[PDB]
C-alpha cells in the first residue's frame, strides 16, 4: 500500500574527546538500508539491505560525499546552537534531523518531512505545505529567517517531489520481495497463575512485519485500556517485530476476555481467547 523513506541524522558534540560524531541511518518503512558513521575506520555510506547493493559505484561515492559534507555542516550547526542558547563550550549537545517522503500505492507524494531537534526538543520543522517553517523558540526563529532569506523550503520541495519519490519508487521495485511483503503475526495466549484467585493472560504477537500493530484486550466486549499492560513493539533481529498485551483477571473469568489483533498482514482482525 503506502510507503515511507526517512533519513535520520544524530550529531553529538563531545568536548575533550574530538570533533562531534555524525551518524546517518536511512530506512524504507521499517527496514534499515544504509548507514554512515563519522567514527568509522574509513567513513563511507554502507549498504544494510541486499536490494541497495545493486546501486552503482557512482551512487556510493555521491551518497558518501553528501554525508561527509553534512558531518561538517552539522558540526557548524552545533557551534551556532551554542551561541543561540548562550551555552558554554564545556557541555555535550545533540542535533537530530529526520526528513523524507511518504508515497501512496500509486507511488505519488502523500507528504514530505524535514524536521530538526536540539537536545531532544523540537527546534524547526518544514510545514506540510513544503513552503513555510515552524520554529519552536526564538533561537530557531533566527534559523527560520535565514532559511526564508535563502529560499530553503523551495529546495526541500523540489527534492521531496522529485528525487525523494523517484528513489523510493526504485527501492520498492528492487526490494519488492521484502519491502512489499507483509508478514502477519503468529499469535497465542498464555495463562500464568499469580495466586489462588488471579491469573495473568498474555496475548502474544510474533514474527510480524511491518512494525505497526494493534493488540487489545476486551472484557465482555469492552476494551480494557486502563488495565492492560502493553510492552513497546520490539525488533526480533530477523527483520520482524514482537509485541504482547497482558491483563490480570479473576480466576474462573478467563473466558470473558478476548484479545483482538489488527495488522496489515491479516485479511481480517483476529479475535483470540485463552485455550485451556
Amino acid at each position: 500500500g503506502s510507503h515511507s523513506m526517512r533519513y535520520f541524522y544524530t550529531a553529538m558534540s563531545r568536548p575533550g574527546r574530538g570533533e562531534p560524531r555524525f551518524i546517518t541511518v536511512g530506512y524504507v518503512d521499517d527496514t534499515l538500508f544504509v548507514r554512515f558513521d563519522s567514527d568509522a575506520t574509513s567513513p563511507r555510506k554502507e549498504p544494510r539491505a541486499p536490494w541497495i547493493e545493486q546501486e552503482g559505484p557512482e551512487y556510493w561515492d555521491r551518497e558518501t560525499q553528501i554525508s561527509k559534507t553534512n558531518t561538517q555542516t552539522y558540526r557548524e550547526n552545533l557551534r551556532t546552537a551554542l551561541r543561540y542558547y548562550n551555552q558554554s563550550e564545556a557541555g555535550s549537545h545533540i542535533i537530530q534531523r529526520m526528513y523524507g517522503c511518504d508515497v501512496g500505492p500509486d507511488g505519488r507524494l502523500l507528504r514530505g518531512y524535514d524536521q530538526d531537534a536540539y537536545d531532544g526538543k523540537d527546534y524547526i520543522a518544514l510545514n506540510e505545505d513544503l513552503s513555510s517553517w515552524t520554529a519552536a523558540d526564538t533561537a530557531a526563529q533566527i534559523t527560520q529567517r535565514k532559511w526564508e532569506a535563502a529560499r530553503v523550503a523551495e529546495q526541500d520541495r523540489a527534492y521531496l517531489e522529485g528525487l525523494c519519490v523517484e528513489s523510493l519508487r526504485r527501492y520498492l521495485e528492487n526490494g519488492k520481495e521484502t519491502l512489499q511483503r507483509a508478514d502477519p503475526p503468529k499469535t497465542h495466549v498464555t495463562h500464568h497463575p499469580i495466586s489462588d484467585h488471579e491469573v495473568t493472560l498474555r496475548c502474544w504477537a510474533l514474527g510480524f512485519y511491518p512494525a505497526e500493530i494493534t493488540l487489545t484486550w476486551q472484557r465482555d466486549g469492552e476494551d480494557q485500556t486502563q488495565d492492560t499492560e502493553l510492552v513497546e513493539t520490539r525488533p526480533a533481529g530477523d527483520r520482524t517485530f514482537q509485541k504482547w498485551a497482558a491483563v490480570v483477571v479473576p480466576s474462573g473469568e478467563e473466558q470473558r476476555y478476548t484479545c483482538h489483533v489488527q495488522h496489515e498482514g491479516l485479511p481480517k482482525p483476529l479475535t483470540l481467547r485463552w485455550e485451556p
Binding site: 544524530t10 553529538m12 548507514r35 545533540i94 537536545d119 531532544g120 498474555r202 513497546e232 520490539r234
Partner: protein, 99 residues
C-alpha cells in the same frame, strides 16, 4: 531534558533448552544517546555482543538493539545490564522466557 531508557530482555525465537537462539536487549526511549549495555551469562559479561546502528523515534528518543547468539538451558541465568546518565547505578534486568 534527559530521558531514562526502557529495557526489554528477550529471545529472537521462543526459548527451547538446548536449542540455539539469539538473546536480545532492546533499549529505547532514552536521551541523550550515550548508553552502556552488557549482556550477562550467570552474572558475567558476554564477549563480542553486537548492536544496531543508532536510530531514534518520532519523539526524538533513541533506540538500540544489543544481541548475541546463545543456547538456553534450564539453569543458566541471563540478564542485561544498562547504565545511562539518568541512572545513579546500573539497572539489571533478568531474562524471563515468558516476557
Amino acid at each position: 531534558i534527559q530521558r531514562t531508557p526502557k529495557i526489554q530482555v528477550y529471545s529472537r525465537h521462543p526459548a527451547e533448552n538446548g536449542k540455539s537462539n539469539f538473546l536480545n536487549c532492546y533499549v529505547s526511549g532514552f536521551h541523550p544517546s550515550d548508553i552502556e549495555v552488557d549482556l550477562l551469562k550467570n552474572g558475567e559479561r558476554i564477549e563480542k555482543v553486537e548492536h544496531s546502528d543508532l536510530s531514534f523515534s518520532k519523539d526524538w528518543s533513541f533506540y538500540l538493539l544489543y544481541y548475541t547468539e546463545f543456547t538456553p538451558t534450564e539453569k543458566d541465568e541471563y540478564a542485561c545490564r544498562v547504565n545511562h546518565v539518568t541512572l545513579s547505578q546500573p539497572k539489571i534486568v533478568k531474562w524471563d522466557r515468558d516476557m
